[PDB]
RNA sequence: GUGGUGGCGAUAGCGAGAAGGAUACACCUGUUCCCAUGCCGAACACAGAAGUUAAGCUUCUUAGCGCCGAUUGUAGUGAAGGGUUUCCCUUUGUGAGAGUAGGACGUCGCCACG
RNA sequence: GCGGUCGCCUCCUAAAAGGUAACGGAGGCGCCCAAAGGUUCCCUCAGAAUGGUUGGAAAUCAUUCGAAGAGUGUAAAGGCAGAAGGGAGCUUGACUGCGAGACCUACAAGUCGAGCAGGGACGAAAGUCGGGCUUAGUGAUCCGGUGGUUCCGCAUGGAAGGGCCAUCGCUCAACGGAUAAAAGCUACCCUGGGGAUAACAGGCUUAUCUCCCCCAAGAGUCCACAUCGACGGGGAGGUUUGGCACCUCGAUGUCGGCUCGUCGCAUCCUGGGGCUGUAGUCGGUCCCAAGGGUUGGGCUGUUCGCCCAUUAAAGCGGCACGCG
RNA sequence: UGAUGGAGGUAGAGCACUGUUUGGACUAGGGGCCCAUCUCGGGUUACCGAAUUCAGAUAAACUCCGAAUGCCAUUCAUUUAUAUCCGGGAGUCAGACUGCGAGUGAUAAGAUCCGUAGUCGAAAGGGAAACAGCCCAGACCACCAGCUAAGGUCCCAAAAUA
């Protein structure tokens, strides 16, 4: 089951992308290290 | 050097780019004359349009 | 005779024109019959020529069919309007343009293969003359 | 059941063999590597071919077989 | 001459045969070293210079294959016409593919050691 | 009408730019991948022969040949072996703000994009990276949900409620989406139009149909051709079953019968003739021949057809399937 | 229109790929026949025969090749006179046939659907007997003048009993 989720920013918490992941391939909450433009710089991104 | 020529055959009835040969040759109603230079594009034009006109020198 | 398969079950009708790309000329058989005119020509057409010649050379002797019914032509049954999708397949055809050599013979005297392509030929649709080998 | 098919592309080439094109401008429309970019071309996501900077088309032959864009500034 | 390194459509290739290592390149000896194999110092990496042109590589011969390929003719066809018009023919311009005559066992550069 | 189809991608049709229709010929899509993405490094396949325990055509191994005959997540085309194919290490560029200029295009959209800035991954560096070899994997607005926001806040401060930004809710698949919300009967029917469009007749076509031929394997005791003639081939006719939709829908009346006929000949009888597997009487087949003639009933609306009884014969067709 | 340079895979042709395919050679191998059966090893049909090879075909959805044309472009050349853009006003969205290239159809249709050029549509005049779409040719008018196109010249009926 492929859904669509949110990666939201661990330190201010902005919803800054939309991607989308196989929920049986990574049953875990998505963690990509994506650059936040609110903070501009890189910061660790959880789907939420 | 010249060419006098001189269209014999109407335009009624013929594709669009040899009635366009004709005009800028410049030819109006049937047997109607001009003189051109011998140019190779000249006689090119002559040449497309050779079954509608007569040439002289 | 009929493709043991075919890559599309249905196929243009086409356009003959002109000589006959090759085949033109008697490669194997000490005779054969050329075909002067362009014209389909149906398994059914082929195979009554072949018996025919095969039944008056009593056997004695090789035949060769040079052409095949590689094509398919469909039709439609009557009572069927135009429109709803091309017909289903109906029967098999060779399209033999002028010069192709239809049939070749040998294996025997000469009198006997002119006898025996002339009934073949009259059991084809196309006009054809008889040919010799070079 | 037939009856289907998708809209046409448009390929092929934009620009002319000896025109003089801005910097950027679409040269050739392609599924693949038809052509190849030569000099001062790039080649897009989708295997198109353009102009880096301006000058004027020319569509040599790559080798043997394969042919090529390049845009020579003037 | 040899080793690097390039340009030009293989006319630069392949096959076959032959000669050479002066240097050079090579095989070649080892795994202590950085480094390594989903096992193997075979590879890659490193150290070294006993032996050998055997192979690779360079040079040379070879048209067997591959490659290039004129001319002529023809198919097709633009244009103008004709015919008995699913097709065919004439004039004019263009003109292949194929088959061939032949060409070709490469050439044009730069660097270093000779 | 029934069946099929409706949006998107690939090929052929498509006539060597592009584009190009048909209820034309073929297939695919409504995803998938946390690597099957990025980068650095490295690697080259499918098959075949030969040899080899279980092991056999074919599991695994080795040598050789092998230029792609493999693979490329997924259809096809194009492309890729200087890889875009395969393996490993590290990573998240499957980045943010954009964007000269282009392609495509009625619009809405769609596509490509160097380059600039911010901050990064890989790599020594060059440099590569704004997803995947490329091209489908999608849906306008309205309305609503969620998060953010130095925006607004109906006297003022708040609030309520909005805006902006990000994103979610479509088989709105009839896929440019009528409405948040909808199936049928009409022969009780009615109106406005169309010969733009069917049924009758005409027209064109002649596949089919009727008729006539070609070849002659054969049947005919022998003997292709007295007679019949397979497998095939070629025509004529315009009476059949059809195809098209050209006149007529501000009306061209439809079957059968009756009355009246008239014409064609591919002749049912009568007339002339050739051949005969023609002894004779009968015939068979073919040729010429359209002058005349070619029936009365039972059944059925019938045409047709069967039957009864006759006749020299009980012809086949056209004439708006002649003639309201 | 000429010159020059290009993009592209059609006609044609070809078999280098993929399909379809014919004959020959050879045969892996499969077949039934007998001996040998532990069904084991032959010996067979010019038995059938893969793949290979030779020769020969074939293709809208094959291509080692590949035109003529058309197309794009050039501060180019000759001739010519339109092209853009901005705005006011429209009508058109039933087309027809003819020639050529295709599909559908039956290589039928005054059929249907495209591409392409012409004409009709919206075009009178001459020819084709009559005959929108074919051939010749574009009517501003007057003439009891002349020359020609297609097509014609024995009579209807102008012109050759050339
Ligand atoms: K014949
Ligand atoms: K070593
Ligand atoms: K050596
Ligand atoms: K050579
Ligand atoms: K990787
Ligand atoms: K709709
Ligand atoms: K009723
Ligand atoms: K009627
Ligand atoms: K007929
Ligand atoms: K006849
Ligand atoms: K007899
Ligand atoms: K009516
Ligand atoms: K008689
Ligand atoms: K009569
Ligand atoms: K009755
Ligand atoms: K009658
Ligand atoms: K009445
Ligand atoms: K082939
Ligand atoms: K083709
Ligand atoms: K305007
Ligand atoms: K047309
Ligand atoms: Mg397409
Ligand atoms: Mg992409
Ligand atoms: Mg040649
Ligand atoms: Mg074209
Ligand atoms: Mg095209
Ligand atoms: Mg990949
Ligand atoms: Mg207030
Ligand atoms: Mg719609
Ligand atoms: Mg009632
Ligand atoms: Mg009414
Ligand atoms: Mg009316
Ligand atoms: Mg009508
Ligand atoms: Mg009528
Ligand atoms: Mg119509
Ligand atoms: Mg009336
Ligand atoms: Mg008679
Ligand atoms: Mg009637
Ligand atoms: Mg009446
Ligand atoms: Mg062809
Ligand atoms: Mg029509
Ligand atoms: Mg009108
Ligand atoms: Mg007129
Ligand atoms: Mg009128
Ligand atoms: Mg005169
Ligand atoms: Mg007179
Ligand atoms: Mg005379
Ligand atoms: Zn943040």
Same mark, same amino acid.
């Given at each position: 089951?492929?859904?669509?989720?949110?990666?939201?920013?661990?330190?201010?918490?902005?919803?800054?992308?939309?991607?989308?992941?196989?929920?049986?391939?990574?049953?875990?909450?998505?963690?990509?290290?994506?650059?936040?433009?609110?903070?501009?710089?890189?910061?660790?991104?959880?789907?939420? | 050097?010249?060419?006098?020529?001189?269209?014999?055959? %109407?335009?009624?009835?013929?594709?669009?780019?040899?009635?366009?040969?004709?005009?800028?040759?410049?030819?109006?109603?049937?047997?109607?004359?001009?003189?051109?230079?011998?140019?190779?594009?000249?006689?090119?034009?002559?040449?497309?349009? %050779?079954?509608?006109?007569?040439?002289?020198? | 005779?009929?493709?043991?398969?075919? =890559?599309?079950?249905?196929?243009?009708?086409? =356009?003959?024109?002109?000589?006959?790309?090759?085949?033109?000329?008697?490669?194997?058989?000490?005779?054969?019959?050329?075909?002067?005119?362009?014209?389909?020509?149906?398994?059914?057409?082929?195979?009554?020529?072949?018996?025919? #010649?095969?039944?008056? #050379?009593?056997?004695?002797? =090789?035949?060769?069919?040079?052409?095949? /019914?590689?094509?398919?032509?469909?039709?439609?049954?009557?009572?069927?309007? #135009?429109?709803?999708?091309?017909?289903?397949?109906?029967?098999?055809?060779?399209?033999?343009?002028?010069? =192709?050599?239809?049939?070749?013979?040998?294996?025997?005297?000469?009198?006997?293969?002119?006898?025996?392509?002339?009934?073949?030929?009259?059991?084809? /649709?196309?006009?054809?003359?008889?040919?010799?080998?070079? | 059941?037939?009856?289907?098919?998708?809209?046409?592309?448009?390929?092929? $080439?934009?620009? $002319?063999?000896?025109?003089?094109?801005?910097?950027?401008?679409?040269?050739?429309?392609?599924?693949?590597?038809?052509?190849?970019?030569?000099?001062?071309?790039?080649?897009?996501?989708?295997?198109?071919?353009?102009?880096?900077?301006?000058?004027?088309?020319?569509?040599?032959?790559?080798?043997?077989?394969?042919?090529?864009?390049?845009?020579?500034?003037?």
């Amino acid at each position: 089951m492929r859904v669509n989720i949110t990666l939201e920013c661990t330190s201010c918490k902005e919803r800054n992308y939309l991607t989308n992941k196989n929920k049986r391939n990574n049953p875990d909450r998505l963690e990509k290290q994506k650059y936040c433009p609110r903070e501009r710089k890189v910061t660790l991104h959880r789907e939420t | 050097a010249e060419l006098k020529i001189t269209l014999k055959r %109407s335009v009624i009835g013929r594709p669009q780019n040899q009635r366009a040969t004709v005009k800028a040759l410049g030819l109006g109603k049937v047997n109607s004359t001009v003189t051109k230079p011998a140019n190779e594009a000249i006689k090119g034009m002559v040449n497309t349009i %050779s079954h509608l006109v007569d040439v002289e020198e | 005779l009929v493709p043991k398969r075919v =890559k599309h079950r249905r196929e243009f009708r086409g =356009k003959m024109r002109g000589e006959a790309k090759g085949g033109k000329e008697v490669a194997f058989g000490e005779w054969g019959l050329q075909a002067t005119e362009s014209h389909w020509i149906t398994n059914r057409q082929i195979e009554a020529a072949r018996i025919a #010649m095969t039944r008056y #050379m009593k056997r004695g002797g =090789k035949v060769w069919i040079k052409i095949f /019914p590689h094509k398919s032509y469909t039709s439609k049954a009557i009572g069927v309007r #135009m429109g709803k999708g091309k017909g289903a397949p109906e029967g098999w055809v060779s399209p033999v343009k002028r010069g =192709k050599i239809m049939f070749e013979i040998a294996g025997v005297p000469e009198e006997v293969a002119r006898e025996a392509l002339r009934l073949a030929s009259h059991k084809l /649709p196309v006009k054809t003359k008889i040919v010799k080998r070079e | 059941s037939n009856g289907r098919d998708s809209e046409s592309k448009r390929l092929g $080439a934009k620009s $002319a063999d000896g025109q003089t094109v801005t910097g950027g401008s679409i040269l050739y429309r392609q599924r693949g590597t038809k052509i190849y970019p030569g000099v001062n071309v790039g080649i897009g996501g989708d295997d198109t071919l353009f102009a880096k900077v301006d000058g004027v088309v020319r569509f040599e032959r790559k080798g043997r077989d394969k042919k090529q864009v390049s845009v020579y500034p003037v």
